[PDB]
Amino acid sequence: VTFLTKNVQINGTQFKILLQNGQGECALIALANVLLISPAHARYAQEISRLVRGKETVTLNELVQTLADMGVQNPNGTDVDKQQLLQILPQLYSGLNINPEFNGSFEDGVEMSIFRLYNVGIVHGWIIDGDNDPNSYEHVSKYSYMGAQKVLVQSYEIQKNNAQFENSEQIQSDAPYLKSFLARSATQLTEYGLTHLREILVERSYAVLFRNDHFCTLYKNNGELFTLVTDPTYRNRKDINWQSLKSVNGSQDSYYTGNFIPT
Amino acid sequence: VTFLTKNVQINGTQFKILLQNGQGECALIALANVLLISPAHARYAQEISRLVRGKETVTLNELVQTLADMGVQNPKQQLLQILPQLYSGLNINPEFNGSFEDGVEMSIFRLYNVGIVHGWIIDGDNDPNSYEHVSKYSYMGAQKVLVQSYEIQKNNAQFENSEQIQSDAPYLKSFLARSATQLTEYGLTHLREILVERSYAVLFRNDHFCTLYKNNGELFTLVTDPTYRNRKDINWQSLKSVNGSQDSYYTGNFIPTSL
Question: Length of chain B in residues, anyone?
Answer: 259
Q: Report how many helices (DSSP H) and strands (DSSP E) chain B contains, helices first.
A: 10, 8
Residue positions of A annotated with a catalytic role:
26, 214
Q: State how far residue B177 is from chain A, nearest Cα, in angstroms.
A: 5
Name the E strands within A70-132: 121-124
Taking the CA atoms of B144, B145, B149 and B152 in sequence, report the sign of the dihedral they define. positive
| Closest C-alpha among B27, B28, B63 to residue B47 | B63
Query: How were these coordinates obtained?
Result: X-ray
| Closest C-alpha among B91, B94, B31 to residue B64 | B31
End-to-end Cα separation, chain B, in angstroms:
36
Plot region of B24 (φ>0 → left; ψ -120 to 50 → alpha; else → beta): left
Measure the CA–CA gap between A176 and B194, rounded to whole angstroms: 31
Q: Enter the DSSP assignment of A179.
A: H
Q: Does A146 touch chain B (CB under 8 A)?
A: yes
- Beta-bridge partners for A215: A210
Q: State how far residue A169 is from chain B, nearest Cα, in angstroms.
A: 15
- What does this entry list as its resolution, in Å? 1.8
How open is the CA angle A212-A214-A216, to the nearest 5 degrees?
A: 105
Measure the CA–CA gap between B11 and B131, rounded to whole angstroms: 41
In chain A, what's the furthest Cα-to-Cα distance?
Answer: 62
Angle of helix B139-155 versus helix A145-161 axis, rounded to 10: 130
The helix (H) or strand (E) run that includes residue A159 is helix A145-161
Provide the CA B201 distance to its chain's centre, in angstroms: 8
| Closest C-alpha among A179, A130, A247 to residue B206 | A179
In chain B, what's the furthest Cα-to-Cα distance?
Answer: 62
Provide the CA A215 distance to its chain's centre, in angstroms: 3
Long-range contacts of B189-192 (CB under 8 A, 24+ apart): B190/B98, B190/B119, B190/B121, B191/B117, B191/B118, B191/B119, B191/B219, B191/B239, B192/B217, B192/B218, B192/B219
How far apart, in Å, are the Cα atoms of A43 and each of A39, A47, A48, A49?
8, 9, 11, 10
Q: Enter the DSSP assignment of B230.
A: T
How far apart, in Å, are the Cα atoms of B16 and each of A7, B9, B34, B45, B128?
58, 8, 11, 12, 46
| Closest C-alpha among A36, A20, A30 to residue A218 | A30
Measure the CA–CA gap between B31 and B210, rounded to whole angstroms: 8
The helix (H) or strand (E) run that includes residue A65 is helix A61-73
Measure the CA–CA gap between A27 and B170, rounded to whole angstroms: 13
| Closest C-alpha among B193, B195, B200, B201 to residue B39 | B200
The shares of helix, strand and coil residues in chain A, as percent rounded to the nearest 5, are 40, 15, 40
Count of other CB atoms within 10 angstroms of residue A32: 28
Measure the CA–CA gap between A189 and A184, rounded to whole angstroms: 10
Measure the CA–CA gap between B219 and B195, rounded to whole angstroms: 9
Q: Which of B91, B103, B180 lies at the smallest CB-CB distance from A187?
A: B180
Q: Do B22 and A99 touch (CB under 8 A)?
A: no
User: For residues A206 and A219, is the Cβ–Cβ distance under 8 A?
Assistant: yes
Enumerate residues 6+ apart whose C-beta is below 8 A from B162.
B152
Q: Enter the DSSP assignment of A202.
A: P
